[PDB]
Amino acid sequence: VDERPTEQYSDIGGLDKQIQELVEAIVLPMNHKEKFENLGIQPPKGVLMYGPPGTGKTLLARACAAQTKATFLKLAGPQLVQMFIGDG
Amino acid sequence: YSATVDQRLPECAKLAKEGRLQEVIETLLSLEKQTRTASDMVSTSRILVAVVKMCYEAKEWDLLNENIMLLSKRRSQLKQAVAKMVQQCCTYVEEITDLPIKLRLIDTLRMVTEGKIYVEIERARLTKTLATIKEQNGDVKEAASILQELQVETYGSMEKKERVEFILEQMRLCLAVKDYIRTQIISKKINTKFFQEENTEKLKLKYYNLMIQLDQHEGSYLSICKHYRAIYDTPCIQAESEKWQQALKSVVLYVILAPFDNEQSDLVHRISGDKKLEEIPKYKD
Amino acid sequence: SKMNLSEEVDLEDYVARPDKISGADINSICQESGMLAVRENRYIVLAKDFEKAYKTVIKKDEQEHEFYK
Amino acid sequence: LLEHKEIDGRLKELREQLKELTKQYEKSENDLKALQSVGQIVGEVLKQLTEEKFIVKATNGPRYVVGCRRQLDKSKLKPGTRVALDMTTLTIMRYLPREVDPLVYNMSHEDPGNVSYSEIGGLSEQIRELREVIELPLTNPELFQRVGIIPPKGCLLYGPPGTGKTLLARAVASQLDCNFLKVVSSSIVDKYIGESARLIREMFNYARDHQPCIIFMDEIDAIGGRRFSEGTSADREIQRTLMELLNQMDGFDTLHRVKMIMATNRPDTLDPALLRPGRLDRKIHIDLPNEQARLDILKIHAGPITKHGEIDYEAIVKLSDGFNGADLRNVCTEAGMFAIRADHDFVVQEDFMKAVRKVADSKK
Ligand SMILES: Nc1ncnc2c1ncn2[C@@H]1O[C@H](COP(=O)(O)OP(=O)(O)O)[C@@H](O)[C@H]1O
Ligand SMILES: Nc1ncnc2c1ncn2[C@@H]1O[C@H](COP(=O)(O)OP(=O)(O)O)[C@@H](O)[C@H]1O
């Protein structure tokens, strides 16, 4: 469980719209959860992200954990396909 | 449409004060038809209350009969519109004191009302008016039949409460029938609507008197014993000293004649030390 | 037997209907008739709610394309 | 009032503020009585040799013949009853509740969230039917008994996914205020050969131990998916689990007050034996919401969202055909999501309309 993934958004490049969407997807509702409760609605709870197999979703997740300075958990689909019962 | 009808309300009212049924019925039919097609909110209510008001003030029952059977036979009618029509006929049939007109009008309100609607409580009001009419006419078995056809268990519009107590009106006119089984069945199935009728009211006396007279004809005494003790207990019976002493005489002469078991032993050694029977020492003795 | 009276219901005719129903289905039918009686708030079932229960239990709705038949 | 300013100037702190040391003394006395205790062995009673001598097997240890404490309900010490043993004299000190499987524990202590009955929308006839078939034996059993029928064992709710079977069962459980066993049939199958049926056994043993209980087994087609003799190992163990479920629900040991709810999306593939009555007495069709049902769902899920000025439902109903339940809830939620895209503290009609648009596109 790494805590410091060491990204400043200067490591990830070319996903500027994607990274702004990242920020407003997780950290922006996190700091302004009070403005979410003012609306009387619950914040978004997860993000669906897709791309080619070598498109760097992992590093973007690290960068997100970096600027949000939060702890970082991680699960892998190809890790979860085997290991039979227990993945859950 | 609403503009046509709202500038027509003066025009159609000044036309209505002439009677002249045919043409106004035709135009109101056309406008009500277009508003049923278009699903309008207030113009439909105004136009149907208008036609019903015009028939009632113009003093024809065949014409309002035709209005009812047309927009019952006619389709795409707003249910609130039919409800307002029948409730207006109700408030246009309970105040009139014409026996043939009243009976014909309740016949029409009976045969229109397949497909009961949220206003079926207000229709229960008119069926209790019909209950008064069958009380004054002599019909007894058909009386209970008719006021039970407007049933209460299919009636789901708001909790029964005391409001639709015509379960107890059924037990009452059916005590006139003397068929206690119906009353026991409704009492058993009142489970959906709380086991006991709403406390701190005046129908307590009515229901418990139906119960005591029903038991009197039965010949059972023990449940009636408990019931008359309960009649004693209530503070409502403790308003005037007379009423207490009369009802207490009744309670005691109801309680002496019972056989013996253990639950009545519980009752009697719970009630033996009661302090409000000493004003009448004969029955205490 | 433990059921309340049927009020002159053709139990023998319901029996006589040719239908491949097991004793579990008979117990169902009777139970469902009781449920319908409770819902309609009448303690003595008769042909109406009994018939609705009978139709309800053995639905066996074919829903089958007719080219099979 | 000479030396009676407030209270002697001192008793205010001495009487209660400095009497917190008596609360600490109470804590010390609890430590005392905890100290005099010695702890106890645990075990399961195996047999009643006589009125006094009991064969008791300690867990992961040897078995003994032991006596019982003088004041105890011997009529309660059935075989298999988990019990406590004094560590030194080895006598029955106190009975214990039967050990619950960790999976059954987890499946049991999930809070239903006290969901009310209003928050369903447009299921009126079916929810009335389910209310009857589950609630009524749990509210007035005497009604069923006097009628002359046996209270129903349970029923099935079949329909397309997202149609509220889970929510409806949860509402029944919350309204009953009883023990609820929320289960999904895909989660009990195990690679180990005999563990799935064993988990079913533990589930129903807990249910019988914690009456009144509601067994909600979602996705039942993953267990009761018809019996065939092809012979593959996995589906054959599925047959075995189905047989165990049938036994536990309408087998030799009758069920009293457990009332089990089962939901699925493929009612047709269920095994006829499971589909036979006695086990599942009613089949409820929780079908896709109708137009009136759709508007009901819309309005019931539009409560918490703050509306400004005008929000109508018939437009969303007519232009949101084919939806179901959670999709309409998604419409409301992502309308709220839209509300911060243009930074409102409220919602507008066009917001709702574009929300149902995007939800419909996601539906395509
Ligand atoms: N724009 C980018 N910046 C940095 N690394 C990238 C970028 N695009 C792709 N990558 C690389 O792609 C890999 C991520 O693969 P990923 O899509 O996470 O695999 P999977 O889909 O199996 O999770 C990383 O090793 C990362 O170095
Ligand atoms: N009347 C309704 N019908 C269907 N779903 C509803 C209804 N009311 C609310 N829901 C939504 O259903 C979701 C729960 O999934 P649900 O549809 O109950 O399970 P299932 O997929 O088994 O039907 C809740 O998030 C809730 O928002």
**Is the Cβ atom of D120 under 6 angstroms away from ligand 2?**
yes
The alpha carbon of residue C24 is apart from the nearest alpha carbon of chain D, in Å, by 6
DSSP letters spanning D115-169 = --SSSS-S-HHHHHHHIIIIIHHHH-HHHHHHHTSPPP-EEEEE-STTSSHHHHH
| Binary contact (B153, C41; C-beta < 8 A) | yes
Task: Work out the burial of residue D318: count CB atoms within 10 Å of its CB; fewer than 13 is exposed, 13-18 middle, 19 or more buried.
Answer: exposed
Separation in Å, CA B216 to CA B183, B221, B230, D26, D119: 15, 8, 17, 64, 49
Give kind and range of the element (H or E) at residue D40.
strand D40-48
Asked if D341 contacts A44 with a C-beta cutoff of 8 angstroms, the reply is: no
A and B make contact (3+ CB pairs below 8 Å): no
- Is the link from the previous residue into D102 a cis peptide, with omega within 30 of 0? no
- Answer whether B212's CB lies under 8 Å from B227's CB: yes
For residue A59, the CA-to-ligand 1 centroid distance in Å is 6
**H or E stretch at D337:** helix D326-341
Cα distances (angstroms) measured from residue D168 to each of B260, D119, D321:
51, 9, 22
Q: Residue C10 has which token pair?
A: 């053709």
| Residue B39 contacts D where some CB pair is shorter than 8 Å | no
> Is the CB–ligand 2 distance for residue D164 below 6 Å?
yes
Instruction: Answer whether D166 contacts ligand 2 (Cβ < 6 A).
Output: yes
Burial class (CB in 10 A: 0-12, 13-18, 19+), D267: middle
**H or E stretch at A81:** helix A77-81
In DSSP notation, D66-98 reads EEE-SSS-GGG--TT-EEEEETTT-EEEEE-PP
Provide DSSP, chain B. -HHHHHHHHHHHHHHHTT--HHHHHHHHHHHHHHHHHHT-SHHHHHHHHHHHHHHHHHT-HHHHHHHHHHHHHSSS--HHHHHHHHHHHHHTTSS---HHHHHHHHHHHHHH-SS--TTHHHHHHHHHHHHHHHHHH---HHHHHHHHHS-SSS--SS--TTTS-HHHHHHHHHHHHT-HHHHHHHHHHGGGG-SSPPSSSSHHHHHHHHHHHHHHHHT--HHHHHHHHHHHH-GGGGSSHHHHHHHHHHHHHHHTT----SHHHHHHHHHTT-SSSTTSHHHH-
3-state secondary structure of D49: coil
**3-state SS class at D65:** strand
| Cα–Cα distance measured from residue D179 to residue D259, given in angstroms and rounded to the nearest whole number | 11
Q: Which ligand is nearest to the CA of D261?
A: 2
Distance D165 CA to ligand 2 centre (A): 7
Q: Chain A: nearest CA to D344, how far in angstroms?
A: 8
Instruction: Kindly give, in sequence order, each residue whose CB lies less than 8 Å from that of residue D296, ignoring residues fewer than 6 positions away.
Output: D121, D122, D289
Atom of ligand 2 at shortest distance to CA of D293? Answer: 1
- Rounded to 5 degrees, φ, ψ at D218 are -75, 160
Using CA atoms, how far apart are residues D128 and D132, in angstroms rounded to an integer? 6
Give the contacts of D58 (CB within 8 A, at least 6 positions apart): D41, D42, D43, D64, D85
> Under an 8 A CB cutoff, do B191 and D139 touch?
yes
* D146:C39 CB<8 A: no
- C58 touches C19 (CB < 8 A): yes
Two tokens, residue B120 = 């079926």
DSSP code of residue D307? B
- The encoded tokens of residue A82 equal 């085997």
Q: Which of D143, D175, D291 should one mutate to test binding to chain B, selecting the residue with the greatest count of B CBs within 10 A?
A: D143
Give every CB contact of residue B172 below 8 A, 6+ residues apart in sequence: B206, B210
Say if B202 is an interface residue toward chain D (CB within 8 Å): no
The CA-based dihedral angle spanning residues D292, D117, B157, B49, taken in that order and rounded to the nearest 10 degrees: -40
Q: Is B191 close to D140, i.e. CB distance below 8 A?
A: yes
In units of Å, what resolution does this entry have?
3.2
Tell me which residue of D267, D190, D250 sits closest to D215, measured CA to CA. Answer: D250
A14 is in an annotated binding site: no
Cα(A4) to ligand 1 centroid in Å equals 18
- What are D282's strand-pairing partners? D155
CA distance B216 to B224: 8
Closest-CA distance of chain C to residue D283, Å: 10
Q: Which phi and psi angles does D65 have, rounded to 5°?
A: -105, 125
Any idea which ligand is nearest the CA of D165?
2
Distance CA D262, CA D274 (A): 11
| Chain C residues touching B185 at Cβ < 8 A | 41-43
Tokens of B229: 């003790």
Beta bridge partners of D54: D48, D66
Residues 6 or more apart whose CB falls under 8 angstroms from that of A40 comprise D304, D305, D306
Sheet holding D154-158, edge to edge: D179-184, D213-218, D260-264, D154-158, D282-285
Q: How far apart are CA D219 and CA D187, in angstroms?
A: 10
Rounded to the nearest whole angstrom, what is the distance from the C-alpha of residue A19 to the centroid of ligand 1? Answer: 14
Which tokens sit at D1? Answer: 């009032």
Q: Are D289 and D184 in contact (CB under 8 A)?
A: no
Nearby residues of A45 by Cβ (< 8 Å), 6 or more positions away: none
The first and second tokens of residue B159, run together, are 């909790």
How would you classify the pairing of strands D179-184 and D213-218?
A: parallel
Interchain contact, D136 vs C30, CB within 8 Å: no
CA distances in angstroms from B228 to B35, B146, B234, B262, C65, listed in the order given: 60, 33, 10, 18, 69
Chain-centre distance of CA D315, in angstroms?
A: 37
CA dist B225 to B168, B219, B232, B268, B272, Å? 21, 12, 11, 10, 14
B110, B116, B119, B120: CA torsion to nearest 10? 60
Starting from the CA of residue D115, give the closest ligand.
2
Residues of B in contact with C41 (CB under 8 A): 153, 185-186, 189
Instruction: Report the DSSP beta bridge partners of residue D55.
Output: D47, D65
3-class SS of residue D42: strand
Helix and strand totals (H; E) in chain D: 14, 10
Q: HSE-up of B14 (CA within 13 Å, CB side)?
A: 4
Q: C31 near D281, Cβ under 8 Å?
A: yes
The whole-angstrom distance between residue B227's C-alpha and the CA centroid of its chain comes to 26
**Residue from D340, D341, D345 whose CB has the most chain A CBs within 10 Å, to mutate:** D340
* Cα–Cα distance measured from residue D16 to residue A61, given in angstroms and rounded to the nearest whole number: 56
Distance CA A78, CA B83 (A): 64
What's the rounded Cα separation, in Å, for the pair D270 and D200?
17
D313, amino acid identity:
Y
Cα B18 vs. chain centroid, distance in angstroms?
A: 38
Between CA D100 and CA D206 the distance in angstroms is 7
Q: What is the DSSP letter of D107?
A: H
Residue D216's SS3 state is: strand
Query: What dihedral do alpha carbons A62, A67, A71, A75 form, nearest 10°?
Result: -30
Residue among B107, B58, B112, B124 at smallest CA distance from B81: B112
Whether residue A86 is annotated as binding a ligand: the answer is no
Question: What is the Cα–Cα distance from A8 to A25, expressed in whole angstroms?
Answer: 18
Would you call D190 an interface residue with chain A, using a CB distance cutoff of 8 Å?
yes
Minimum-distance ligand 2 atom for the alpha carbon of D263: 22
Which helix (H) or strand (E) segment holds residue A82: the answer is: none
> What is the Cα gyration radius of chain A?
15
Q: Residue A43, annotated ligand binder?
A: no
**CB burial of residue B3 (10 Å; 0-12, 13-18, 19+):** exposed
- CA geometry: angle B142, B146, B149, nearest 5 deg: 135
> Does residue A60's CB lie within 6 angstroms of at least one atom of ligand 1?
no
Interacting residues of B38 by C-beta distance below 8 A, sequence separation 6+: B1
Q: DSSP secondary-structure letter at D9?
A: T
Q: A-chain residues within 8 Å CB-CB of D304?
A: 40-41
Contacts of C38 in chain B (CB under 8 A): 189
Q: D197-218 as b/e, with b when 16 or more CB fall inside 10 Å? A: bbbbbbbbbbbbebebbbbbbb
For residues D43 and D95, is the Cβ–Cβ distance under 8 A? no
Q: Chains with 3 or more CB pairs closer than 8 angstroms to A?
A: D
Contact D191 A44 (CB under 8 A): no
Contacts of B186 in chain C (CB under 8 A): 41
* Residue with token string 């009609």: D349
Largest CA distance in chain D: 101
Q: Which ligand is closest to the CA of D159, given by its number?
A: 2
- Running DSSP on this structure, what letter comes out for residue D215? E
Distances (CA, A) of A71 to A67, B69, D101: 11, 74, 32
* Token pair in block for residue D349: 């009609």
- Contact at CB, B153 and C40, closer than 8 angstroms: yes
**Experimental approach:** cryo-EM
CA distance D168 to D117: 8
Q: Specify the 3-state DSSP secondary structure of D214.
A: strand
D199 lines ligand 2 (CB under 6 A): no
Are D241 and D200 within 8 A, CB to CB? yes
| Chain center to CA of A45 | 11
Q: Do at least 3 CB pairs under 8 Å connect A with C?
A: no
Of A18, A58, A62, A81, which is best to mutate to test ligand 1, by the most ligand atoms within 8 angstroms of its C-beta? A58
**In this structure, how many other beta carbons lie within 10 angstroms of the beta carbon of residue B262?**
7
**Token representation of residue B142:** 């058909």
Dist CA C31 CA C28 (whole Å): 5
